[PDB]
Write a protein that binds this ligand. Sequence first.
Ligand code: V96
Ligand code: MN
Ligand code: MN
Ligand code: ZN
Ligand code: ZN
Length: 144
Amino acid sequence: MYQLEKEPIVGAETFYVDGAANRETKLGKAGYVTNRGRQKVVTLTDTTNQKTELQAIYLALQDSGLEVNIVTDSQYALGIITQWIHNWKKRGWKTPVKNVDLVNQIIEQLIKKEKVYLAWVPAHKGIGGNEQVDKLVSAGIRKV
Ligand SMILES: N[C@@H](Cc1ccc(O)c(-c2c(O)c(O)c3c(c2O)C(=O)c2c(cc(O)c(C(=O)O)c2C(=O)O)C3=O)c1)C(=O)O
Ligand SMILES: [Mn+2]
Ligand SMILES: [Mn+2]
Ligand SMILES: [Zn+2]
Ligand SMILES: [Zn+2]
């Protein structure tokens, strides 16, 4: 009964989200930079790569208005969220055993929104949005 936008909401502020974790220490960071000049980065413990990407999306929804554009490089986070929206109650749908709690608070947050655009872009270089948030969350977590 909720449906993500097929194209970016024109006018809405865009959040370039990212996360990174290190597998030896389970330390990591999640955060965002936006096209209206606001950024946030938080440090986490006992986390994974997949967890930190979801965490980034969560702060995006946390800190944005009713219409938000979110660009992620995590096809996992996009898929697991999108699969939850689409299988909106099925007597034939088992729920994922991974990150169940995190994916559930995101859903809660996103049900509150009026319009969300969520899109995947591959990790890439340049001086664009995904590139700034990459190195912000990669700081002290991985070499890039
Ligand atoms: N582009 C710069 C920095 C750089 C270098 C080298 C790099 O590898 C990256 C780099 C990132 O900065 C990322 O943020 C991510 C990835 C990166 O590779 C992923 O690869 C990835 C990610 C999320 C996922 O969800 C999946 C998934 O869901 O399957 C995968 C995936 O690999 O499958 C993800 O977020 C970034 C350079 O060229 O040095
Ligand atoms: Mn990423
Ligand atoms: Mn990245
Ligand atoms: Zn509106
Ligand atoms: Zn870019």
